[PDB]
C-alpha cells in the first residue's frame with residue numbers, strides 16, 4: 001500500500017467508504033429514537049446523535065480527500081438485517097434489545113473498524129479518525145452504565161437479543177473480508193478487536209466470564 | 222494480585238480443555254478461530270505461603286498455540302501476546318509472569334517497541350519472564366539428580382541445549398561457579414552468540430546437537446522449539462539424565478531405556494494444596510501441588526512485595542538474583558521436583 005494507488009484501492013475504498021458513512025448515518029438516527037423510549041436521558045442522546053452527524057461529515061471529507069464515489073445501494077443492504085431488527089424492536093417498546101444493537105453491537109463494530117484503520121490509512125484520513133475513536137468509546141459507556149443499573153430485569157432479554165443479532169456481525173465481516181484486505185486490514189484482526197470491545201462491555205454490565213464465552217461465540221465464528 | 226499468562230500445547234489440547242471446561246462449541250474449531258480469540262481470565266487462584274501470608278491471583282489464557290509459528294503467523298502470535306498483557310493491566314494485576322512462549326515472542330520480535338496497545342501504555346514494571354527462578358530450579362534439579370544416582374557432578378559432562386538463551390546462559394554461570402561442573406557443552410542455532418558465551422565463561426566446548434548428545438551424562442533442554450524432536454536411546458550414553466524444561470516438551474517422545482532417566486525440569490512443588498483447575502490440564506504429576514517455576518516467580522514476587530520486572534530481557538540474569546529468588550522460594554514452601562522412582 002503506502003499509496004492510495006487507485007484502480008484497486010479506489011474500487012475497494014468505494015464500498016468501505018459507503019459502509020462507514022452509512023453506519024455513521026444509521027447510528028445517528030438510531031441514537032435519538034431511544035429518547036422517546038427513555039425519558040430522562042433524552043437530551044444526552046441528541047448530543048451523541050449529533051456527534052455521529054459530524055463523524056459522517058468527516059468521513060465524507062475523506063471522500064473529499066480522494067477521488068472516490070460511494071454507493072449506498074450496496075451499503076444499505078449491509079445494514080438491512082441489522083436495521084430491520086432495530087426497527088421492529090423499537091415498535092414493540094423493547095428498549096433493552098434496542099440498546100444492545102446500537103450501544104454495544106454497532107459501536108464495538110465501529111471501535112474495531114477504526115482502530116484497525118488508523119495505521120494503514122492515508123495520512124490525511126489518519127488524523128480525522130484518531131479523533132473519532134475516543135467518542136465511540138464514550139458512546140459504548142452510555143449503554144454499559146444504563147444496563148448495569150438495570151441488570152437483573154434486563155439480563156434475560158440481553159441474552160436473547162445477543163443470540164439473534166451477534167451472528168449477523170460474523171456474516172457481515174465475511175462480506176467485507178476481501179475489501180478490507182485491499183486497504184491493508186486483515187479479517188482476523190477485525191474480529192479480535194470486536195470481541196475485545198464487546199467482551200469488555202458485557203463484563204462491566206455484569207456478566208461472569210462463563211457467560212461471556214458462550215455469548216461472544218454466537219455465529220459459526 | 223499476581224497474574225499467570227499462559228497458553229496451550231496443541232490444538233488437540235485446546236479441543237480437550239475446551240470440552241473439559243464445558244464449551245462443546247469451542248472444541249469444533251480450527252486454527253482460524255484461535256487466531257482471532259480474545260484473552261480470558263479463566264481461573265482465580267488463592268495460595269497460602271509457609272510463612273502464613275495469603276495471596277490471590279488470576280490466570281489469563283492468551284490463546285496462542287505453537288502451530289501459529291510453524292504456519293508463519295508472526296503477525297497473529299504478536300497480537301496474542303500484546304492483548305494478553307494489555308488485558309492483565311486493565312484488570313489491575315500488580316505483577317504477572319509471561320508463561321511459556323509468550324516471553325520468547327516478546328524478546329524475539331522487539332515488542333518493547335510496541336508498548337502502546339489500544340492506546341494503553343504497557344508498564345513493563347508489571348511483568349516478569351519468570352526466567353530467573355526457572356534457571357535456579359533447573360540448577361537445583363541437576364545437583365539433586367546427581368546425588369540421587371551416585372554421580373559425582375564435579376567430574377561429569379553436562380550439555381545445555383539452548384546455552385546462549387536467557388535461561389540457558391544463566392544455568393551455565395551457575396553450573397560454572399556454584400557447582401564446579403566438569404565439562405560444559407554449548408549447543409544453539411546462532412554462532413556469534415555462542416562465541417561470546419564461551420568468552421564470558423572462560424570455558425566450555427561448542428558442538429552441534431547431533432554431536433553433543435552421545436557425549437553428555439546430563440542433558441539439559443531449554444530450547445525454544447515449537448515442535449520437539451525425536452531422540453533414540455541408542456545415541457545416548459548410559460546412564461543418561463535428561464532434564465526437559467521446555468514448553469512444549471523438547472522431547473517429542475518418551476525416551477526410555479536401560480540407563481535413561483527423564484526428569485520433567487523447571488517444575489516446583491508447594492507444600493499446600495492449591496485452589497485451581499489449570500495445572501490439571503498441563504499434565505503435572507500432581508496438579509494440586511506442582512506447577513511451573515516461572516509461574517512460581519510471580520507468586521514469589523507477590524509474597525515479597527517486589528512489584529517489578531525482576532526477570533527481563535535476555536542475558537541479564539546474575540547469580541546474585543538467582544540466589545535471592547531461591548532464598549525466597551525455599552522460605553515460602555517450594556521445592557524442586559525430583560526423579561520419579
Ligand SMILES: CCCCCCCCCCCCCCCCCC(=O)SCCNC(=O)CCNC(=O)[C@H](O)C(C)(C)COP(=O)(O)OP(=O)(O)OC[C@H]1O[C@@H](n2cnc3c(N)ncnc32)[C@H](O)[C@@H]1OP(=O)(O)O
Pocket residue numbers: 213226227228229238239242247258259261263282319320321322324325352355382383384385386387388389408409410411414430443444445446466467468487498499500502503513514515516535
Ligand atoms: C472464547 C475464548 C476461548 C477460551 C477457551 C480456552 C479456555 C481454556 C484455557 C485454560 C487453560 C488452562 C491450562 C493452562 C496452561 C498451563 C501451562 C501454562 O500456560 S504455560 C507453562 C509455563 N511456562 C513454562 O512452561 C515455562 C517453562 N518454559 C520455559 O522456561 C521457556 O519456554 C523456555 C525454557 C523453553 C524458553 O527459554 P528462554 O531462555 O526463555 O528462551 P530464549 O528464546 O531465550 O532461548 C532461545 C535459545 O534457545 C535455543 N534454541 C532454540 N531452538 C533450538 C534448536 N532447535 N536447537 C538448539 N537450540 C535451540 C537457541 O539457541 C536460542 O537462541 P539462538 O541460538 O537460536 O539464538
Ligand SMILES: [Fe+2]
Pocket residue numbers: 024027051052055110136
Ligand atoms: Fe460515530
Ligand SMILES: [Fe+2]
Pocket residue numbers: 027052107110136139
Ligand atoms: Fe458512534
